[PDB]
């Protein structure tokens, strides 16, 4: 729900190169993707342990 709007904001703001917001857009992208990789990995490990419990 957060990622599909931040990426749409990325496509909307940078149809042309806006050099003022270029130093912060990279930090926003790195922050949201490093959050997402950690959440998806923890979800997979939780589902794996729940599968191994039976």
């Amino acid at each position: 729900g957060v990622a599909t709007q931040l990426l749409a904001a990325y496509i909307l703001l940078f149809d042309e190169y806006n050099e003022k917001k270029a130093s912060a857009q990279k930090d926003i992208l790195i922050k949201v993707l490093d959050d997402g990789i950690t959440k998806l990995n923890e979800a997979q490990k939780s589902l794996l342990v729940s599968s191994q419990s039976f």
Binding site: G1, L6, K21, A24, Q25, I28, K31
Partner: peptide, 8 residues
């Protein structure tokens, strides 16, 4: 989403 939009 609003917290990430602040960082611009």
């Amino acid at each position: 989403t609003t917290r990430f939009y602040v960082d611009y």
